[PDB]
Amino acid sequence: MPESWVPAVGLTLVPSLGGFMGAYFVRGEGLRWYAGLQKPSWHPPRWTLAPIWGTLYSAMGYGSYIVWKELGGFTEDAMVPLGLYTGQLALNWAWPPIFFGARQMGWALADLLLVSGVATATTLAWHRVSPPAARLLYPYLAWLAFATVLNYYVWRDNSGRRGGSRLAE
Numbered sequence: 225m226p227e228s229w230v231p232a233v234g235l236t237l238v239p240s241l242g243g244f245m246g247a248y249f250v251r252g253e254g255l256r257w258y259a260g261l262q263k264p265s266w267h268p269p270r271w272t273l274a275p276i277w278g279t280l281y282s283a284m285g286y287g288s289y290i291v292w293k294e295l296g297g298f299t300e301d302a303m304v305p306l307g308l309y310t311g312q313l314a315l316n317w318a319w320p321p322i323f324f325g326a327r328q329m330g331w332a333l334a335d336l337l338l339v340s341g342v343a344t345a346t347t348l349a350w351h352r353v354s355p356p357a358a359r360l361l362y363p364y365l366a367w368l369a370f371a372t373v374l375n376y377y378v379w380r381d382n383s384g385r386r387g388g389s390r391l392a393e
């Protein structure tokens with residue numbers, strides 16, 4: 225009978241499966257690919273970075289607690305946000321199934337997916353009822369820009385600043 229919010233805890237652990245198995249692809253396939261193309265793979269390995277969910281998890285637990293504490297603890301009213309968030313995030317953020325497309329520049333689907341999944345879902349789910357929590361998450365945008373910018377960098381790395389001549393003589 226955990227003292228902390230059982231819902232927020234488990235539901236917050238859910239993204240741990242999609243985020244773990246998700247990035248698990250770049251964990252090895254990424255470290256290697258870097259040997260071929262130029263990638264910012266120099267950033268601390270998922271070992272030190274992956275803790276992204278650890279920090280956001282702490283803030284999450286806090287926000288959640290507030291949301292439910294407002295509408296009145298965890299009730300049928302809290303099941304709509306928490307749930308709609310778990311379900312929407314599951315099928316929507318479920319980006320690990322793109323392993324097949326992870327070998328293509330489309331690999332960006334990861335960032336775009338998880339970014340809009342937790343962000344969008346939390347906007348209509350949590351921020352919709354409790355605006356204060358949204359502030360505890362606010363510092364999560366940096367993370368969104370982290371992955372998002374990552375992919376953007378790769379693209380411009382192998383293909384950027386285009387506009388030259390052809391053959392001519």
Ligand SMILES: CC[C@@H](C)N(C)C(=O)c1cc2ccccc2c(-c2ccccc2Cl)n1
Nearest residue numbers: 243246247250254267268270273334335371
């Ligand atoms: C490529 C280096 C990755 C492992 N890195 C240091 C990250 O911080 C990171 C963590 C993640 C955690 C969960 C899901 C994705 C990521 C992505 C990432 C960013 C853009 C595209 C694909 C991926 Cl796995 N990147």
